[PDB]
RNA sequence: GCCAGGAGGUUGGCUUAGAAGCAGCCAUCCUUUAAAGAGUGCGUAAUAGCUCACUGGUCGAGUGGCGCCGCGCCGAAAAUGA
């Protein structure tokens, strides 16, 4: 999931409180860490 | 007798404090809880409860 | 050693062995679980077998005390309708009808169980559950 | 680091249930160690430097002085469970002596119900002579050990009376190869007296053997004496046929065979195939020079194709073998994984034609047959159904017509494997009073079958096994994991001892050596077996990949 | 752990000893090896040090072993987790 | 957010080696209730467990959700110095 243009809201803990100007998707089990790159 | 059969304190476990006899007690009824009162109170024993 | 630990089980009169949750749930006990199957086997001898809830307590000196309850109405609706293995799917197939009395007697027999202690209430809980196992009811 | 006492005492009974009961205590944990207190004689033992050229018995520096007492009591306490003299003489007023306690404790130490806890770091010459003392004073003399057993030459088990003045009966054990003397055959006797320059009769192999010389092995040299008495232990020099697990007797002795029958099976089934054919012979030499020293594993050349099956109780085991192999004998062995036995089988009730006939005048043979060849569930049996109407095919051509089938079923139309559980049948054919030979209709049945399978959609069968695993609950769970994550599905479970069985279906292909894989989801504490039941269709995707050239 | 005089010393899951030492504004306080305490008078500069000792020895390791705030382990497999 | 109430029949029937709200197919509840589901995720080998849902307790003023526009922003790596 890391670095892919779909930074939705995957596992319902994952958040988009936009930082650095490139949305990350922040969760728990970090096989769920999508990124904007 | 009543330490290696019932009271699972094998023997040394239930009578390590036997220097001053640290064991006195037993429950009893009729037919249901009495059969161990014709044993606890009658089997070369003397923990005379109520019955 | 071990002290007082009241643990209950869910066992039918047919599997009499120290197998989970028979053993380790009552291992800290010395639970006479073969004197539980026996004192309860012939106890529910209104049919011979039946599946029944239980509750066995340890008191240190190898003391076991079990308290029991009745079988289910997921067997007193299927034994109340002539459905063999059951009735493949609820809101689908049909096998053997039930009526306004059969359901009433069923609701009766098991009074303190179900949920309420009002004959004109638990009977409703029965009036539903019959449908969820694949069988019709005769109304009027 | 991590040194203890307590924890050992805990996990001992948290895994087995055998009460320890103990004889000595540390002076400081990890490297905080100087000397050792004991609770036997109650003497403050202590060394000094690690090498232990400076031992001592200096006073108790306090600290644990009192603590010895409690467990000392406990020590003494358990002495009241055996020698019932120390019982009253500890629950009255007096003191238990330095002697009858040795017999209470040895009582417990031969009845197997207690476990005198001595420990220590002999890296640094500590804890040595103590455990030695305990060993002499407690360890089971070959006297009270309940006698071994050895069936008379009649068919009834007999006891060995370990008097060094009776019938000479002897067991053997460990088989080395010593470039000096040779086949070192490590033996422990039993009854009677073992002399030198005499003779022995190994009852097992029925061969009479010659004691070339006497042996025991010391720590620094060969102990060469003359006689080994009843139940004394050592080794005999010069003794051919004899291996491990035997029973020899005096040249004229009552002549019996000691029991000593054991059963640990080889779990993992490895395959080994070492290049050319120049190796196979040297491999014969290999498994030859094994078994006599290594009677623990099994060698069974795949009872269908090549590959000598090398099956052993552990991957390591198998690998020190695969290594000594490639070194001692040279065998450039390239270990692979076992093949499998697959079985052709159709799906749809297909009924085709198998003709023959050749007319060039004279004998050219006649043979037209059409048969039912219907299928059966993947466990039934080979069949045939005489559906002959008027005797069109003269019955006497039916025999070979069934084998032509049977031998055109040896190798199927696909991979070429024994077609099974395909209830054939028959029905309508033909003949000619002359041309119709036996082999002609043999070929009728044959070809008819071939067309029937080529067209009838033959799918591939594969062995489905019974894995039955022993395991303590936790591992059990994650092994349900492993098993169902090995293709086919499992079955059930039961609490056997401190364990939980695992009834299991398992296709051998995905199963290849589970022992080391077992010991990864059981982490060692698990056991199992593997067995068989029936054959089954692969879930499709393997019949498009296995179209191998 | 063993805070000698002014210096916090420790040899945890690492070879050599460690010397963690006081910065301006905040203060250490070792009760014993297994549960070190900190008198830090600067809520911002303190938590820095908190997560910095914790970063000195990152715990977890699938099961346990390490330093924890009030931290709770997150479970995974030992001699397993290796297909 | 904070303290807590967070049920019973049931193990829904199916199916499955077992499947309990948790593998899913048809599902398609009623009573005890001020509220508690044929159920949201975590957990399990299936349960147990964890937990949310709804309801009260505190608190004291605002609050989620849906359609729309303008500038943005990510998506956005190529070669002599900008």
From Swiss-Prot, chain A:
HAMAP family per the UniProt record, alphabetical: Ribosomal_bL36
Lineage: superkingdom: Bacteria
Any GO MF annotation of the entry: structural constituent of ribosome
Protein name, entry field: Large ribosomal subunit protein bL36
Ribonucleoprotein in keyword set: yes
Family the entry assigns: Belongs to the bacterial ribosomal protein bL36 family.
Taxonomic source organism: Thermus thermophilus (strain ATCC BAA-163 / DSM 7039 / HB27)
Keywords on record: Ribonucleoprotein, Ribosomal protein
Swiss-Prot record, chain B:
Assembly and interaction partners: Homodimer. Part of the ribosomal stalk of the 50S ribosomal subunit. Forms a multimeric L10(L12)X complex, where L10 forms an elongated spine to which 2 to 4 L12 dimers bind in a sequential fashion. Binds GTP-bound translation factors.
Stated family: Belongs to the bacterial ribosomal protein bL12 family.
Protein name: Large ribosomal subunit protein bL12
Domain of life: Bacteria
Taxonomic path: Bacteria, Thermotogati, Deinococcota, Deinococci, Thermales
Function comment: Forms part of the ribosomal stalk which helps the ribosome interact with GTP-bound translation factors. Is thus essential for accurate translation.
From Swiss-Prot, chain C:
Gene3D superfamilies reported for this sequence: Ribosomal protein L11, C-terminal domain, Ribosomal protein L11/L12, N-terminal domain
Subunit structure and binding partners: Part of the ribosomal stalk of the 50S ribosomal subunit. Interacts with L10 and the large rRNA to form the base of the stalk. L10 forms an elongated spine to which L12 dimers bind in a sequential fashion forming a multimeric L10(L12)X complex.
Gene Ontology annotations for the cellular component aspect, listed alphabetically: cytosolic large ribosomal subunit
Family designation: Belongs to the universal ribosomal protein uL11 family.
Purpose: Forms part of the ribosomal stalk which helps the ribosome interact with GTP-bound translation factors.
UniProt cross-references to NCBIfam families, sorted A to Z: L11_bact
Pfam families from the UniProt entry: Ribosomal_L11, Ribosomal_L11_N
Segments forming a coiled coil: none
Transmembrane segments: none
CDD domains assigned to the protein according to its UniProt record, in alphabetical order: Ribosomal_L11 (cd00349)
Keywords carried by this UniProt record: Methylation, Ribonucleoprotein, Ribosomal protein, RNA-binding, rRNA-binding
GO terms, biological process: translation
Protein name as catalogued: Large ribosomal subunit protein uL11
Modification(s) after translation: One or more lysine residues are methylated.
Swiss-Prot record, chain E:
Source species, domain of life: Bacteria
Oligomer status and interactors: Part of the 50S ribosomal subunit.
Functional note: This protein binds to the 23S rRNA, and is important in its secondary structure. It is located near the subunit interface in the base of the L7/L12 stalk, and near the tRNA binding site of the peptidyltransferase center.
Similarity remark: Belongs to the universal ribosomal protein uL6 family.
Name by which UniProt lists this protein: Large ribosomal subunit protein uL6
Organism: Thermus thermophilus (strain ATCC BAA-163 / DSM 7039 / HB27)
């Amino acid at each position: 999931m890391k670095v892919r243009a779909s930074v939705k809201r995957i596992c319902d803990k994952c958040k988009v409180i936009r930082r650095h100007g490139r949305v990350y998707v922040i969760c728990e089990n970090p096989k769920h860490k999508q990124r904007q790159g | 007798l009543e330490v290696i059969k019932e009271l699972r304190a094998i023997t040394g476990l239930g009578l390590k404090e036997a220097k001053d006899l640290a064991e006195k007690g037993g429950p009893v009824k009729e037919g249901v809880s009495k059969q161990e009162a014709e044993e606890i109170k009658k089997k070369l024993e003397a923990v005379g409860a109520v019955v | 050693k071990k002290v007082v630990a009241v643990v209950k089980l869910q066992l039918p009169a047919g599997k009499a062995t120290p197998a989970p949750p028979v053993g380790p749930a009552l291992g800290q006990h010395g639970a006479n679980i073969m004197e539980f199957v026996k004192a309860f086997n012939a106890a529910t001898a209104n049919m011979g077998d039946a599946i029944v809830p239980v509750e066995i307590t340890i008191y240190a000196d190898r003391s076991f005390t079990f308290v029991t309850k009745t079988p289910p109405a997921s067997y007193l609706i299927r034994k109340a309708a002539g459905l063999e293995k059951g009735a493949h799917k609820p809101g689908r197939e049909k096998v053997g009808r039930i009526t306004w009395e059969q359901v009433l007697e069923i609701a009766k027999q098991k009074m303190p169980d179900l949920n309420t202690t009002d004959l004109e209430a638990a009977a409703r809980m029965i009036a539903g559950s019959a449908r969820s196992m694949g069988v019709e009811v005769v109304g009027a | 680091t991590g040194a203890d006492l307590w924890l050992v005492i805990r996990t001992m009974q948290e895994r087995l249930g055998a009460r320890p009961v103990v004889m000595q205590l540390p002076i400081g944990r990890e490297d905080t160690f100087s000397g050792i207190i004991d609770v036997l004689r109650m003497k403050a033992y202590t060394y000094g430097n690690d090498l232990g050229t400076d031992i001592r018995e200096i006073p108790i520096p306090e600290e644990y002085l009192d603590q010895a007492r409690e467990y000392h009591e406990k020590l003494v306490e358990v002495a009241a469970d055996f020698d019932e003299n120390i019982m009253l003489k500890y629950l009255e007023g007096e003191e238990p002596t330095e002697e009858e306690l040795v017999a209470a404790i040895r009582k417990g130490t031969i009845d197997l119900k207690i476990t005198p806890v001595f420990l220590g770091s002999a890296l640094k010459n500590k804890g040595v002579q103590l455990l030695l003392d305990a060993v002499v004073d407690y360890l089971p003399s070959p006297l009270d050990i309940p006698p071994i057993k050895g069936t008379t030459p009649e068919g009834e088990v007999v006891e060995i009376h370990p008097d060094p003045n009776g019938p000479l009966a002897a067991l053997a054990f460990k088989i080395m190869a010593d470039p000096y003397v040779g086949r070192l055959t490590f033996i422990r006797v039993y009854s009677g007296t073992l002399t030198s320059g005499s003779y022995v009769y190994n009852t097992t192999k029925g061969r009479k053997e010659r004691v070339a010389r006497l042996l025991r092995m010391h720590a620094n040299h060969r102990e060469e004496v003359e006689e080994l008495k009843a139940g004394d232990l050592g080794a005999v020099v010069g003794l051919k046929e004899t291996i491990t697990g035997d029973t020899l007797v005096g040249e004229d002795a009552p002549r019996v065979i000691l029991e000593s029958i054991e059963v640990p099976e080889p779990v993992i089934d490895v395959a080994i195939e070492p290049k050319t054919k120049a190796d196979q012979e040297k491999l014969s030499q290999a498994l030859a020079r094994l078994a006599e020293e290594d009677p623990t594993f099994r060698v069974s050349t795949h009872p269908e194709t090549g590959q000598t099956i090398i099956s052993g109780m552990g991957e390591l085991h198998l690998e020190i073998i695969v290594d000594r192999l490639k070194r001692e004998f040279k065998v450039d062995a390239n270990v692979g994984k076992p093949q499998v036995a697959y079985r052709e089988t159709i799906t749809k009730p297909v009924d085709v034609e198998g003709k023959f006939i050749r007319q060039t005048g004279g004998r050219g043979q006649y043979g037209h047959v059409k048969i039912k060849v219907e299928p059966l569930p993947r466990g039934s049996g080979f069949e045939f159904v005489n559906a002959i109407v008027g005797g069109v095919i003269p019955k006497e051509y039916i025999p070979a017509v069934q084998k032509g089938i049977e031998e055109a079923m040896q190798s199927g139309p696909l991979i070429g494997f024994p077609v099974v559980d395909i209830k054939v049948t028959l029905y309508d054919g033909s003949y000619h009073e002359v041309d119709s030979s036996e082999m002609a209709f043999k070929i009728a049945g044959s070809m008819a079958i071939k067309e029937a399978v080529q067209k009838g959609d033959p799918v591939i069968l594969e062995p489905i096994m019974r894995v039955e695993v022993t395991t303590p609950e936790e591992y059990m769970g994650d092994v349900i994991g492993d098993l169902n994550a090995r293709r086919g599905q499992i079955l059930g479970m039961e609490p056997r001892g401190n364990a939980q069985v695992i009834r299991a279906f398992v296709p051998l292909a995905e199963m290849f050596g589970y022992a080391t894989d077992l010991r990864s989801k059981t982490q060692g504490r698990g056991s199992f077996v593997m067995f068989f039941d029936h054959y089954q269709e692969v879930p499709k995707q393997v019949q498009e990949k296995l179209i191998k050239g | 752990a063993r805070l000698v005089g002014r210096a916090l010393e420790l040899t945890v899951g690492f070879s050599h000893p460690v010397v963690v030492e006081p910065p301006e504004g905040i203060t250490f306080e070792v009760p014993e090896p297994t549960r070190v305490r900190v008198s830090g008078i600067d809520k911002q500069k303190v938590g820095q040090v908190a997560a910095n000792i914790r970063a000195i020895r990152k715990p977890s390791a699938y099961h346990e072993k390490g330093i924890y705030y009030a931290g709770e382990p997150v479970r995974l497999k030992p001699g397993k987790a290796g297909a």
